[PDB]
Symmetry: C3
Subunit: 117 residues, 3 copies
């Protein structure tokens, strides 16, 4: 699993511990070992939501499996909660694109996760 | 709808009201209220297009529906037009990836846009 | 084809020639003319991989076709090879998302490739 957050919130406002909290919470949420989890935070972005330059975020979560209706609503509650508490971004100014990646379409360590054929 | 532009054009070359213009134009183009539209511009990027570092852009438009052959051609004419006029990027050095997102796969406001089933 | 690499490796550590080597190797690997190839490198990123902030990379390759099981394994060997040699990133700290794009969903020059 990998989570990316792009935000107009200033770098200075990103608290110590943020990447590690994302990593651990996502491991728990996805039921996957933390060794697998990648996180990427991009502050100071030139972006608008609803035409307003108030704090907002555009995010993505890629996962091989564990993507779907109820699971995604749970990820959204978790991730919006963290963005609100840690970056002071209103949940209704966040978009998260979820991608259910096929194992054959994810590269890692000189190969992919399709090892069967 | 959300539109992202990554470009090697300098931050100083990005017009002041550029984000607002994109928001309004995309609202009109998508038929959606501006309150839904998100825009994101990333200048000063290290990029090459065709092996050259002349001004270029790599973009994406995500939308739940309203994505398809004819519509995408219309989006491309609109968005390339804006990038050329405002950022002075030639249309043949722009790529735009279009994504038709399922409502269940777009998160917003503590949930997603799949509110119908459990 | 277009390739994006986001990494926490410092800008100064990106060698002269890197974008051009990526362009050339991707042209060769995808079979597409180098005039098509777009490459984008984003250094100095705030990232963690497995909870650690040692060098890592999150990448994507979008292509109209030329995406598939064996082809993607070959792209991964090629691209991880380059990231290891040029940016000193361990291949096991790299993820690459592959996208097989429909030509109608790729805009260019005021239109699409459909
Ligand atoms: C998460 C992930 C999904 C897509 C792109 C990057 N990361 C992830 C990472 C590693 C494995 C290994 C085996 C099975 N599943 C995953 C996975 O979902
Ligand atoms: C645009 C959009 C699509 C995908 C990801 C982010 N933004 C968008 C936003 C909100 C709604 C709500 C209801 C129906 N459609 C959309 C929509 O296309
Ligand atoms: C590579 C590509 C794929 C998706 C998005 C951006 N670039 C690429 C570029 C142009 C053409 C034209 C005709 C056929 N195929 C491609 C292509 O794979």
């Amino acid at each position: 699993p990998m989570f990316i957050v792009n935000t107009n919130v200033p770098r200075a406002s990103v608290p110590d511990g943020f990447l590690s909290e994302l990593t651990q919470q996502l491991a728990q949420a996805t039921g996957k070992p933390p060794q697998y989890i990648a996180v990427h935070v991009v502050p100071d972005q030139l972006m608008a939501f609803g035409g307003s330059s108030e704090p907002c975020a555009l995010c993505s979560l890629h996962s091989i499996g564990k993507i779907g209706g109820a699971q995604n609503r749970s990820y959204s509650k978790l991730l919006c909660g963290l963005l609100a508490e840690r970056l002071r971004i209103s949940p209704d100014r966040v978009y998260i694109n979820y991608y259910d990646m096929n194992a054959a379409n994810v590269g890692w360590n000189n190969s992919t996760f399709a090892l069967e054929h």
